[PDB]
């Protein structure tokens, strides 16, 4: 019940209570073990526990499948510092160590109770008698597939062995399966469900990408008479809410063209708000110095350029639209990590959208020349189309983000451009259409 999981959360993990109620529900669903569970949570949300704590409670050994050996080793070390009885059979062991591990596995009451195996070694010929003994023994209790998204062709990563993991799942049917992905799209979710032969009832536990204390709004650089003036007003307002409070935290401003990023930083500085370019081309010493002066409060706002974190971020303002809605959502995610309300601005532009679309098309053409990962190119084009629709579309911005990422529609009573002032959005899109 609840008491057992709570005890585990404190004795072996150290946490007093679950970070979020959603993962509490997910972990209890896995513990019940009635049906296959698909948990999609961001990194640092504790998704690991959703397969780790149930395994700590599982009657028998849990087989975890991860793409790379290095990730398996990192998880093994994290489990070992907690003194948990974890093992790995990836052939990483020498001869004697492999013999000992096989001897513990083959005998009853296996000492290993969570085994990290790359799919190759699970489907390797030599390991088949061991797996047959495991199933016949009924030792396997959970069949976790970490980074399950690698099975889906439309995902950013592809794993050919995760396809045969579906047949593996078809074997050892008596045990449930837990599929985990850092981020999930409904199409990717469908691919995961189909390829892994999971049971038809699947418990999907997905974090709502919606964030109450985030304000989402979009403006069209053609409509606004002076874009830098709007950027300055936004920066001032977000940075300083009241005279007594004074400037707080720091802002972020993404931009694709570095030549434009330096210009934006210098223009902001000249207007009155200091900014530091932090463009990737800059030398390592200078980039470190900038990242530092931003961590301290000396620098008000930092221009991310291609690449970026701080506890409080007053605002994010994309001078240019992002390549993919996943990228834009991640970039805006660091907005307002603190409780206080923040803001997220997208200065969507037809010319910039055309430029980045052409760049995406050229990249897809190069990929096709490679003759591989065609589904990846299709997914990238689909994501860019989704982002441009998001900027164009009339309606609740949070709702469109939820539609793309597939989580439920959010009830943002406050903190959305459309909901609060639909007439303003109507007028703005009418002006944009007239301009175009």
């Amino acid at each position, epitope marked *: 019940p609840e008491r057992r999981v709570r005890s585990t959360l404190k004795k072996v993990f150290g946490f007093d209570s679950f970070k979020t*109620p*959603l993962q509490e*529900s997910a972990t209890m669903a896995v513990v019940k073990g009635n049906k296959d569970v*698909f948990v999609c949570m961001p990194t640092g949300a504790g998704k690991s526990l959703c397969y780790q704590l149930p395994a700590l409670l599982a009657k028998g050994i849990t087989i975890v499948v991860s793409p790379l050996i290095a990730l398996i080793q990192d998880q093994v070390d994290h489990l070992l510092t907690l003194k948990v009885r974890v093992s790995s059979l990836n052939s990483k062991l020498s001869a004697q160590e492999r013999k000992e591990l096989l001897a513990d596995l083959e005998r009853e009451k296996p000492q290993t109770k969570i085994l990290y195996i790359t799919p190759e070694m699970a489907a390797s010929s030599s390991f088949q008698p061991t797996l047959n003994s495991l199933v016949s023994r009924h030792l396997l209790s959970y069949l976790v597939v970490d980074e399950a998204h690698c099975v889906s062709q439309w995902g950013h990563d592809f794993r050919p062995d995760y396809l045969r993991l579906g047949a593996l799942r078809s074997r050892l049917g008596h045990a449930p399966c837990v599929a985990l992905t850092a981020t999930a799209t*409904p199409q990717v*979710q*469908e691919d995961v*469900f189909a390829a892994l032969h999971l049971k*038809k*009832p*699947v*418990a*999907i*536990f*997905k*974090t*709502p990408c919606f964030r109450a204390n985030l304000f989402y709004d979009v403006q069209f650089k053609e409509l606004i008479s002076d874009p830098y003036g709007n950027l300055k007003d936004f920066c001032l307002k977000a940075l300083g809410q009241e005279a007594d409070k004074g400037l707080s935290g720091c802002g972020i401003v993404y931009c694709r063209t570095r030549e434009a990023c330096e210009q934006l930083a210098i223009e902001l500085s000249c207007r009155g708000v200091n900014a530091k370019a932090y463009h990737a081309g800059l030398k390592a010493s200078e980039r470190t110095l900038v990242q530092n002066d931003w961590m301290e409060e000396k620098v008000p706002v930092i221009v991310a350029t291609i690449s970026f974190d701080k506890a409080n971020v007053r605002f994010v303002a994309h001078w240019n639209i992002a390549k993919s809605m996943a990228g834009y959502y991640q970039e805006s995610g660091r907005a307002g990590r603190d409780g206080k309300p923040s803001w997220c601005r997208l200065y969507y532009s037809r010319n910039d959208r055309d430029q980045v679309s052409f760049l995406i098309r050229k990249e897809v053409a190069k990929l096709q020349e490679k003759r591989g990962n065609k589904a990846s190119d299709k997914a990238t084009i689909m994501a860019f189309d989704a982002l441009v629709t998001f900027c164009e579309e009339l309606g609740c911005r949070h709702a469109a983000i939820a539609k793309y990422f*597939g*989580d*439920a*529609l*959010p*009830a943002c009573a406050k903190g959305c451009d459309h909901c609060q002032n639909p007439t303003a959005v109507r007028r703005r899109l009418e002006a944009l259409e007239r301009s175009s």
Partner: nanobody, 124 residues
């Protein structure tokens, strides 16, 4: 859960037409495919119509000419209109609603498939 309800079942003479309705209640993010199954007395279930995402329609070579399937995703409703009905199609009709994906503002969801109770059609 999702409550599928059939409607429009009627007894039409040979040559006439009648429409069937299949509305999916509950909160559904999307549906993979709604398929109208036809089952007669003393016979194996036979597949009649299928509507998938994007409006793709799959029929039976013989049954294709008579029936037409049309779905609305926003409404979550699929209509199977029967034209030039024949005395052979005297079977009960069901919906499959294969691959139903449901979710809540919290985050909990399900991906099970749900079946409608059924609608009857008799032909002179």
């Amino acid at each position: 859960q999702v409550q599928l309800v059939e409607n429009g079942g009627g007894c039409v003479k040979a040559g006439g037409s009648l429409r069937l309705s299949c509305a999916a209640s509950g909160s559904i993010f999307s549906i993979n495919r709604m398929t109208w199954y036809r089952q007669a007395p003393g016979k194996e279930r036979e597949w009649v119509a299928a509507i998938t995402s994007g409006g793709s329609t799959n029929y039976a070579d013989s049954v294709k000419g008579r029936f037409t399937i049309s779905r609305d995703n926003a409404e979550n409703t699929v209509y199977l209109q029967m034209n030039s009905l024949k005395p052979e199609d005297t079977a009960v009709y069901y919906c499959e609603a294969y691959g139903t994906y449901t979710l809540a503002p919290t985050g909990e969801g399900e991906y099970d498939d749900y079946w409608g109770q059924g609608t009857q059609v008799m032909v002179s």
